[PDB]
Amino acid sequence: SLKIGIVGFGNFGQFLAKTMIKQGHTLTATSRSDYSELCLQMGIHFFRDVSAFLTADIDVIVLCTSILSLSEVVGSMPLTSLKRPTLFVDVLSVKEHPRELLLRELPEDSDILCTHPMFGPQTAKNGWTDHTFMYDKVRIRDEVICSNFIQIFATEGCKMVQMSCEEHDRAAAKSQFITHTIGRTLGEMDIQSTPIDTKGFETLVKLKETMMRNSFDLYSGLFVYNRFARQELENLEHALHKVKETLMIQ
Amino acid sequence: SLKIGIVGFGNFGQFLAKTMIKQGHTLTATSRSDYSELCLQMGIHFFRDVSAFLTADIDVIVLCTSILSLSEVVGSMPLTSLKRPTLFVDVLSVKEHPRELLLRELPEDSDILCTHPMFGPQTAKNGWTDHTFMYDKVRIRDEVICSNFIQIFATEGCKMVQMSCEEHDRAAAKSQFITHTIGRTLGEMDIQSTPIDTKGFETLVKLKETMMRNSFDLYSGLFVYNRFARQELENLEHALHKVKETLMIQ
Numbered sequence: 435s436l437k438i439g440i441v442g443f444g445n446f447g448q449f450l451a452k453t454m455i456k457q458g459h460t461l462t463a464t465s466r467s468d469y470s471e472l473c474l475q476m477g478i479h480f481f482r483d484v485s486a487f488l489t490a491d492i493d494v495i496v497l498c499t500s501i502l503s504l505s506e507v508v509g510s511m512p513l514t515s516l517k518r519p520t521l522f523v524d525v526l527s528v529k530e531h532p533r534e535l536l537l538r539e540l541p542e543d544s545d546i547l548c549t550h551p552m553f554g555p556q557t558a559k560n561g562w563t564d565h566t567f568m569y570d571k572v573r574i575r576d577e578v579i580c581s582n583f584i585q586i587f588a589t590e591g592c593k594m595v596q597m598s599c600e601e602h603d604r605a606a607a608k609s610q611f612i613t614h615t616i617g618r619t620l621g622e623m624d625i626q627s628t629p630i631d632t633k634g635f636e637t638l639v640k641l642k643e644t645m646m647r648n649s650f651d652l653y654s655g656l657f658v659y660n661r662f663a664r665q666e667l668e669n670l671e672h673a674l675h676k677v678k679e680t681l682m683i684q
Numbered sequence: 685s686l687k688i689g690i691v692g693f694g695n696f697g698q699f700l701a702k703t704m705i706k707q708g709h710t711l712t713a714t715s716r717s718d719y720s721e722l723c724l725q726m727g728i729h730f731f732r733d734v735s736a737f738l739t740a741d742i743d744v745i746v747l748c749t750s751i752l753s754l755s756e757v758v759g760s761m762p763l764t765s766l767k768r769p770t771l772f773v774d775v776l777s778v779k780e781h782p783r784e785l786l787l788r789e790l791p792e793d794s795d796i797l798c799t800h801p802m803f804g805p806q807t808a809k810n811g812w813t814d815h816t817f818m819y820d821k822v823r824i825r826d827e828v829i830c831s832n833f834i835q836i837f838a839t840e841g842c843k844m845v846q847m848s849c850e851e852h853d854r855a856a857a858k859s860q861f862i863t864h865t866i867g868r869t870l871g872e873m874d875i876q877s878t879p880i881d882t883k884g885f886e887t888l889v890k891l892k893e894t895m896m897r898n899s900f901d902l903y904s905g906l907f908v909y910n911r912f913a914r915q916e917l918e919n920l921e922h923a924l925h926k927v928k929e930t931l932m933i934q
């Protein structure tokens with residue numbers, strides 16, 4: 435409890451590491467880019483080469499690369515260099531895609547846990563308490579290891595939500611994707627504070643600031659790999675034109 | 685300590701009344717609809733017809749009708765029946781229109797103060813403190829009465845902002861109007877809480893519920909009577925379209 439290897443040590447991978455290190459887990463990391471110095475600072479063992487990574491002593495592998503790159507990343511991995519059957523955890527913001535991919539590409543005897551912490555650096559600055567953690571036990575035999583990993587979030591007092599990947603994607607297309615879409619639209623407008631802001635407008639400016647601090651890759655992945663996203667983008671445009679037209683009538 | 689009459693005892697009219705009564709001003713009301721029983725519950729005299737209202741003892745008349753109705757309402761007022769020069773105060777959400785209308789329609793010896801408290805029943809439930817109050821001293825000769833009215837909001841800890849009616853409508857088109865438009869758009873979509881709401885999405889549901897509690901009359905008036913509103917609506921529509929365009933080429 436627990437030796438954890440992180441694939442993709444960018445913004446979100448780092449976020450998770452800080453709390454897992456605090457709880458006492460032993461971390462290993464690997465990534466496309468060089469995080470040697472940062473991992474040195476944090477006492478994480480960093481492997482630049484993913485084949486070297488897969489030979490380390492690891493209970494759990496956490497996939498933390500961008501949605502867009504997950505196919506490339508998993509596809510290149512020498513999964514035949516896996517030393518034991520391992521638990522694979524993804525933390526992608528969309529869920530049907532990693533689920534099908536990992537089911538197709540991973541060795542059969544390896545376990546699959548699909549997850550999405552509904553929070554991050556911009557929204558969980560202090561702690562994780564009363565933030566939501568979604569997960570789906572896609573292929574779990576070793577309940578002990580699975581339970582240990584899931585406990586990482588429970589003991590931070592996350593709200594715990596078990597849900598299918600498809601139901602996560604339907605619900606996320608109608609909520610998170612719309613939320614990001616609005617934040618970006620406001621970012622494209624570059625809204626600015628005024629002397630006479632309303633509470634509502636202050637709220638939108640803060641949403642703009644937060645949504646824009648995510649990568650464009652992340653936002654795109656929400657759309658490209660969520661099959662329910664396109665319809666929500668449509669409903670959003672269709673609703674704005676309904677309001678616009680009632681204004682024209684008036 | 686003022687004799688204050690409200691014209692238009694609707695939602696916002698009643699909101700202003702509650703605080704002015706508490707401060708110890710003598711308050712009386714008139715309106716298109718009959719608020720006899722509500723005013724009996726609240727302890728103030730209601731005049732059903734404006735003619736009787738105009739011949740009472742009043743230092744300050746506050747106009748709290750809808751933006752759309754202002755011109756009709758002021759036009760139908762037997763303003764010649766006024767006993768004394770009186771302070772007229774506007775609290776409409778747009779400002780160039782009432783400033784122009786009142787300078788045109790009022791007796792010359794009546795004073796004019798144009799205001800927009802940047803808050804209401806839905807956003808200032810407990811107390812006015814730290815909320816913004818904009819005013820423009822359009823035509824003041826009696827600085828004593830006017831300062832005593834303004835002191836109503838200052839006493840409550842409002843952030844006091846003096847600006848021109850034009851600068852107000854420019855900033856308001858960029859902020860308040862935009863905010864209402866997105867709120868109304870989310871309402872047409874009828875977004876709802878999900879088990880995996882992000883903090884950003886909770887923030888939008890709140891905004892939707894809040895914005896949707898305003899009358900469509902009110903929201904119309906923000907657009908129809910603010911000449912800077914149209915370009916802001918284009919900026920929004922144009923921004924959304926660019927965001928969509930970046931997503932579609934992937």
Ligand SMILES: NC(=O)c1ccc[n+]([C@@H]2O[C@H](COP(=O)([O-])OP(=O)(O)OC[C@H]3O[C@@H](n4cnc5c(N)ncnc54)[C@H](OP(=O)(O)O)[C@@H]3O)[C@@H](O)[C@H]2O)c1
Pocket residue numbers: 441442443444445446447465466467468498499500501503506507525526527528550551552553554555556648649651652
């Ligand atoms: N609040 C959040 O940010 C949040 C919350 C929940 C879930 N997630 C999910 O966690 C994952 C990481 O999110 P993020 O915030 O760190 O930003 P991101 O832009 O979505 O992902 C950045 C990560 O992708 C890595 N990566 C590895 N191979 C890559 C390749 N060929 N192409 C592109 N990127 C590659 C990057 O590696 P290098 O750094 O080595 O270059 C980096 O580690 C995403 O799947 C995201 O959906 C994020």
Ligand SMILES: NC(=O)c1ccc[n+]([C@@H]2O[C@H](COP(=O)([O-])OP(=O)(O)OC[C@H]3O[C@@H](n4cnc5c(N)ncnc54)[C@H](OP(=O)(O)O)[C@@H]3O)[C@@H](O)[C@H]2O)c1
Pocket residue numbers: 691692693694695696697715716717718748749750751753756757775776777778800801802803804805806898899901902
């Ligand atoms: N948070 C807020 O709601 C807020 C904040 C700041 C400023 N304001 C401004 O305060 C004013 C009132 O706002 P509101 O929230 O009460 O809602 P509103 O829908 O903008 O206006 C309601 C008032 O307008 C009256 N009215 C509507 N049409 C009329 C007509 N043809 N003829 C005569 N009177 C008419 C109504 O009279 P009856 O009720 O008797 O029918 C009611 O008193 C507006 O100008 C608004 O821009 C509102």
